[PDB]
Amino acid sequence: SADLRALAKHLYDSYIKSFPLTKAKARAILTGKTTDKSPFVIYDMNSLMMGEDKIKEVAIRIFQGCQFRSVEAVQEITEYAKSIPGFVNLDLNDQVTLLKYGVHEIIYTMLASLMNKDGVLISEGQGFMTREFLKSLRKPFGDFMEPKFEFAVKFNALELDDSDLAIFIAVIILSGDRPGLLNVKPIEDIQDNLLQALELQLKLNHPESSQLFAKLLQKMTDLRQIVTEHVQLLQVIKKTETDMSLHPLLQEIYKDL
Amino acid sequence: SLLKKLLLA
Protein backbone atom coordinates (compact mmCIF):
# COMPACT_ATOMS: atom_id res chain seq x y z
CA SER A 1 0.00 0.00 0.00
CA ALA A 2 2.77 2.49 0.74
CA ASP A 3 4.01 2.24 -2.84
CA LEU A 4 0.43 2.81 -4.04
CA ARG A 5 0.27 6.08 -2.07
CA ALA A 6 3.67 7.17 -3.41
CA LEU A 7 2.38 6.47 -6.93
CA ALA A 8 -0.81 8.50 -6.22
CA LYS A 9 1.34 11.42 -4.99
CA HIS A 10 3.67 11.24 -7.98
CA LEU A 11 0.69 11.41 -10.32
CA TYR A 12 -0.82 14.35 -8.46
CA ASP A 13 2.49 16.26 -8.56
CA SER A 14 2.75 15.54 -12.29
CA TYR A 15 -0.86 16.60 -12.86
CA ILE A 16 -0.16 19.95 -11.11
CA LYS A 17 2.85 20.44 -13.41
CA SER A 18 0.95 19.55 -16.58
CA PHE A 19 -2.41 21.30 -16.14
CA PRO A 20 -2.37 25.00 -15.33
CA LEU A 21 -6.05 25.21 -14.41
CA THR A 22 -6.85 22.53 -11.80
CA LYS A 23 -10.25 21.63 -10.41
CA ALA A 24 -9.42 23.29 -7.09
CA LYS A 25 -8.67 26.59 -8.93
CA ALA A 26 -11.69 26.24 -11.20
CA ARG A 27 -14.17 25.59 -8.36
CA ALA A 28 -12.78 28.67 -6.53
CA ILE A 29 -13.52 30.81 -9.63
CA LEU A 30 -16.99 29.26 -10.16
CA THR A 31 -18.05 29.75 -6.52
CA GLY A 32 -16.53 33.26 -6.35
CA LYS A 33 -14.05 32.38 -3.61
CA THR A 34 -10.98 33.90 -5.29
CA THR A 35 -9.27 37.30 -4.89
CA ASP A 36 -8.94 38.10 -8.62
CA LYS A 37 -11.40 37.52 -11.57
CA SER A 38 -14.40 37.50 -11.98
CA PRO A 39 -14.65 35.92 -15.44
CA PHE A 40 -16.42 37.75 -18.21
CA VAL A 41 -19.87 36.21 -18.69
CA ILE A 42 -21.00 35.38 -22.23
CA TYR A 43 -24.74 34.70 -22.22
CA ASP A 44 -25.95 36.16 -25.55
CA MET A 45 -24.71 37.52 -28.88
CA ASN A 46 -24.06 40.98 -27.51
CA SER A 47 -21.95 39.78 -24.55
CA LEU A 48 -20.08 37.49 -26.96
CA MET A 49 -19.20 40.52 -29.03
CA MET A 50 -18.22 42.54 -25.93
CA GLY A 51 -16.13 39.72 -24.51
CA GLU A 52 -14.54 38.27 -27.68
CA ASP A 53 -11.16 39.77 -26.65
CA LYS A 54 -10.90 36.97 -24.01
CA ILE A 55 -9.50 35.13 -25.84
CA LYS A 56 -17.64 33.72 -40.44
CA GLU A 57 -20.82 33.13 -38.45
CA VAL A 58 -20.76 32.96 -34.66
CA ALA A 59 -21.31 29.19 -34.36
CA ILE A 60 -18.28 28.53 -36.56
CA ARG A 61 -16.07 31.08 -34.72
CA ILE A 62 -16.89 29.33 -31.44
CA PHE A 63 -16.23 25.89 -32.99
CA GLN A 64 -12.82 27.15 -34.20
CA GLY A 65 -11.95 28.54 -30.75
CA CYS A 66 -12.87 25.23 -29.22
CA GLN A 67 -10.54 23.36 -31.63
CA PHE A 68 -7.59 25.47 -30.46
CA ARG A 69 -8.46 24.78 -26.85
CA SER A 70 -8.72 21.06 -27.65
CA VAL A 71 -5.25 21.19 -29.28
CA GLU A 72 -3.77 22.88 -26.19
CA ALA A 73 -5.40 20.24 -23.98
CA VAL A 74 -3.95 17.41 -26.13
CA GLN A 75 -0.48 18.84 -25.54
CA GLU A 76 -1.04 19.08 -21.75
CA ILE A 77 -2.43 15.54 -21.64
CA THR A 78 0.57 14.23 -23.65
CA GLU A 79 2.94 15.79 -21.08
CA TYR A 80 1.00 14.21 -18.27
CA ALA A 81 0.97 10.79 -19.96
CA LYS A 82 4.81 10.90 -20.23
CA SER A 83 4.95 11.25 -16.44
CA ILE A 84 3.04 8.01 -15.79
CA PRO A 85 5.67 5.43 -14.71
CA GLY A 86 6.34 2.98 -17.52
CA PHE A 87 4.62 4.97 -20.25
CA VAL A 88 7.67 6.32 -22.10
CA ASN A 89 9.17 2.82 -22.13
CA LEU A 90 6.22 1.47 -24.10
CA ASP A 91 6.60 0.95 -27.81
CA LEU A 92 6.32 4.41 -29.34
CA ASN A 93 3.54 3.41 -31.74
CA ASP A 94 1.56 2.13 -28.76
CA GLN A 95 2.05 5.48 -26.94
CA VAL A 96 0.62 7.19 -30.04
CA THR A 97 -2.35 4.76 -30.08
CA LEU A 98 -3.09 5.32 -26.35
CA LEU A 99 -3.13 9.10 -26.86
CA LYS A 100 -5.09 8.98 -30.13
CA TYR A 101 -7.92 6.96 -28.60
CA GLY A 102 -7.73 8.29 -25.01
CA VAL A 103 -7.24 12.02 -25.19
CA HIS A 104 -10.87 13.06 -25.75
CA GLU A 105 -12.10 10.91 -22.90
CA ILE A 106 -9.58 12.87 -20.75
CA ILE A 107 -10.62 16.22 -22.26
CA TYR A 108 -14.29 15.56 -21.30
CA THR A 109 -13.28 14.38 -17.81
CA MET A 110 -11.28 17.55 -17.20
CA LEU A 111 -13.91 19.77 -18.87
CA ALA A 112 -16.31 18.69 -16.07
CA SER A 113 -13.97 20.45 -13.58
CA LEU A 114 -14.69 23.72 -15.41
CA MET A 115 -18.48 23.26 -15.57
CA ASN A 116 -21.46 23.82 -13.41
CA LYS A 117 -25.11 23.29 -14.30
CA ASP A 118 -25.22 26.83 -15.80
CA GLY A 119 -22.07 27.13 -17.90
CA VAL A 120 -18.39 26.51 -18.49
CA LEU A 121 -15.14 28.34 -17.71
CA ILE A 122 -13.20 29.29 -20.82
CA SER A 123 -9.83 30.94 -21.60
CA GLU A 124 -8.07 29.68 -18.46
CA GLY A 125 -10.90 30.95 -16.27
CA GLN A 126 -11.15 34.48 -17.71
CA GLY A 127 -14.51 33.83 -19.36
CA PHE A 128 -17.65 31.89 -18.50
CA MET A 129 -19.96 30.81 -21.35
CA THR A 130 -23.51 29.89 -20.45
CA ARG A 131 -25.03 26.46 -21.10
CA GLU A 132 -28.17 28.17 -22.45
CA PHE A 133 -26.12 30.25 -24.88
CA LEU A 134 -24.30 27.22 -26.24
CA LYS A 135 -27.58 25.30 -26.64
CA SER A 136 -29.01 28.28 -28.62
CA LEU A 137 -26.47 27.95 -31.44
CA ARG A 138 -27.82 26.57 -34.71
CA LYS A 139 -27.70 22.82 -35.48
CA PRO A 140 -25.52 20.84 -35.24
CA PHE A 141 -23.39 23.29 -33.21
CA GLY A 142 -25.92 23.68 -30.41
CA ASP A 143 -25.77 19.89 -29.87
CA PHE A 144 -22.03 19.52 -29.06
CA MET A 145 -21.78 20.76 -25.50
CA GLU A 146 -25.10 19.67 -24.00
CA PRO A 147 -24.16 15.99 -23.51
CA LYS A 148 -20.87 17.10 -21.93
CA PHE A 149 -22.87 19.24 -19.46
CA GLU A 150 -25.15 16.29 -18.74
CA PHE A 151 -22.09 14.14 -18.03
CA ALA A 152 -20.49 16.83 -15.92
CA VAL A 153 -23.37 17.43 -13.55
CA LYS A 154 -23.53 13.73 -12.66
CA PHE A 155 -19.76 13.37 -12.53
CA ASN A 156 -19.31 16.46 -10.37
CA ALA A 157 -21.84 14.99 -7.91
CA LEU A 158 -19.13 12.44 -7.00
CA GLU A 159 -17.07 15.28 -5.51
CA LEU A 160 -13.69 14.03 -6.77
CA ASP A 161 -10.68 16.18 -6.10
CA ASP A 162 -7.51 16.71 -8.16
CA SER A 163 -5.71 13.87 -6.31
CA ASP A 164 -8.49 11.47 -7.32
CA LEU A 165 -8.64 12.80 -10.89
CA ALA A 166 -4.90 12.43 -11.48
CA ILE A 167 -5.19 8.63 -10.96
CA PHE A 168 -8.51 8.28 -12.81
CA ILE A 169 -7.05 10.01 -15.93
CA ALA A 170 -3.94 7.77 -15.78
CA VAL A 171 -6.18 4.66 -15.69
CA ILE A 172 -8.04 5.80 -18.80
CA ILE A 173 -4.83 6.52 -20.75
CA LEU A 174 -3.49 3.03 -20.03
CA SER A 175 -6.39 1.15 -21.63
CA GLY A 176 -5.23 -2.08 -23.22
CA ASP A 177 -8.28 -2.46 -25.51
CA ARG A 178 -7.52 0.44 -27.88
CA PRO A 179 -7.52 -0.61 -31.54
CA GLY A 180 -4.20 -1.68 -33.00
CA LEU A 181 -2.04 -1.89 -29.85
CA LEU A 182 1.06 -4.03 -30.53
CA ASN A 183 1.89 -5.15 -27.02
CA VAL A 184 -1.12 -5.16 -24.69
CA LYS A 185 0.41 -6.97 -21.71
CA PRO A 186 2.70 -4.18 -20.41
CA ILE A 187 -0.13 -1.69 -20.78
CA GLU A 188 -2.48 -3.89 -18.78
CA ASP A 189 0.16 -4.43 -16.13
CA ILE A 190 0.61 -0.64 -15.65
CA GLN A 191 -3.18 -0.15 -15.65
CA ASP A 192 -3.72 -2.91 -13.04
CA ASN A 193 -1.30 -1.12 -10.72
CA LEU A 194 -3.01 2.24 -11.41
CA LEU A 195 -6.40 0.65 -10.65
CA GLN A 196 -5.08 -0.60 -7.30
CA ALA A 197 -3.83 2.92 -6.58
CA LEU A 198 -7.22 4.39 -7.54
CA GLU A 199 -9.15 1.96 -5.33
CA LEU A 200 -6.96 2.76 -2.28
CA GLN A 201 -7.18 6.56 -3.03
CA LEU A 202 -10.95 6.44 -3.05
CA LYS A 203 -11.19 4.29 0.11
CA LEU A 204 -8.95 6.72 2.01
CA ASN A 205 -10.11 10.06 0.56
CA HIS A 206 -13.89 9.11 0.32
CA PRO A 207 -14.41 6.56 3.10
CA GLU A 208 -18.18 7.16 3.30
CA SER A 209 -18.77 7.03 -0.51
CA SER A 210 -19.75 3.38 -0.64
CA GLN A 211 -19.05 1.99 -4.17
CA LEU A 212 -17.27 5.04 -5.55
CA PHE A 213 -14.63 2.89 -7.34
CA ALA A 214 -17.41 0.98 -9.15
CA LYS A 215 -19.06 4.25 -10.11
CA LEU A 216 -15.78 5.53 -11.63
CA LEU A 217 -15.37 2.32 -13.64
CA GLN A 218 -18.83 3.09 -15.06
CA LYS A 219 -17.89 6.65 -15.89
CA MET A 220 -15.00 5.25 -17.98
CA THR A 221 -17.63 3.43 -20.07
CA ASP A 222 -19.85 6.54 -20.20
CA LEU A 223 -16.92 8.56 -21.56
CA ARG A 224 -16.59 6.17 -24.50
CA GLN A 225 -20.24 6.79 -25.36
CA ILE A 226 -19.73 10.57 -25.18
CA VAL A 227 -16.87 10.21 -27.65
CA THR A 228 -18.98 8.05 -29.99
CA GLU A 229 -21.77 10.65 -30.01
CA HIS A 230 -19.28 13.48 -30.53
CA VAL A 231 -17.72 11.73 -33.57
CA GLN A 232 -21.21 11.34 -35.04
CA LEU A 233 -21.73 15.11 -34.75
CA LEU A 234 -18.33 15.77 -36.33
CA GLN A 235 -19.48 13.54 -39.22
CA VAL A 236 -22.61 15.76 -39.66
CA ILE A 237 -20.29 18.81 -39.90
CA LYS A 238 -18.07 17.06 -42.47
CA LYS A 239 -21.04 16.10 -44.67
CA THR A 240 -22.65 19.55 -44.49
CA GLU A 241 -20.57 22.72 -43.68
CA THR A 242 -18.25 23.12 -46.72
CA ASP A 243 -16.37 25.95 -44.97
CA MET A 244 -14.70 23.94 -42.23
CA SER A 245 -11.81 21.57 -41.58
CA LEU A 246 -10.07 20.43 -38.44
CA HIS A 247 -6.74 21.56 -37.03
CA PRO A 248 -3.99 19.16 -38.21
CA LEU A 249 -3.50 17.62 -34.74
CA LEU A 250 -7.25 16.85 -34.57
CA GLN A 251 -7.16 15.50 -38.13
CA GLU A 252 -4.60 12.93 -36.90
CA ILE A 253 -6.66 12.02 -33.86
CA TYR A 254 -9.83 11.59 -35.89
CA LYS A 255 -8.16 9.80 -38.84
CA ASP A 256 -10.53 6.82 -39.23
CA LEU A 257 -10.76 6.41 -35.39
CA SER B 1 2.89 11.88 -36.93
CA LEU B 2 2.23 14.99 -34.83
CA LEU B 3 1.44 12.86 -31.77
CA LYS B 4 4.78 11.11 -32.22
CA LYS B 5 6.56 14.46 -32.33
CA LEU B 6 4.87 15.59 -29.11
CA LEU B 7 5.78 12.29 -27.43
CA LEU B 8 9.49 12.57 -28.35
CA ALA B 9 10.02 16.14 -27.09
Ligand SMILES: CCCCCCCCCC(=O)O
Ligand atom coordinates in the same frame (compact mmCIF):
# COMPACT_ATOMS: atom_id res chain seq x y z
C1 LIG C 1 -19.74 25.76 -31.49
C2 LIG C 1 -20.16 24.80 -30.40
C3 LIG C 1 -18.98 24.35 -29.55
C4 LIG C 1 -18.56 22.93 -29.91
C5 LIG C 1 -17.10 22.83 -30.28
C6 LIG C 1 -16.64 21.38 -30.35
C7 LIG C 1 -15.12 21.25 -30.37
C8 LIG C 1 -14.68 19.82 -30.66
C9 LIG C 1 -13.26 19.69 -31.22
C10 LIG C 1 -12.66 18.33 -30.88
O1 LIG C 1 -13.27 17.28 -31.09
O2 LIG C 1 -11.45 18.20 -30.33
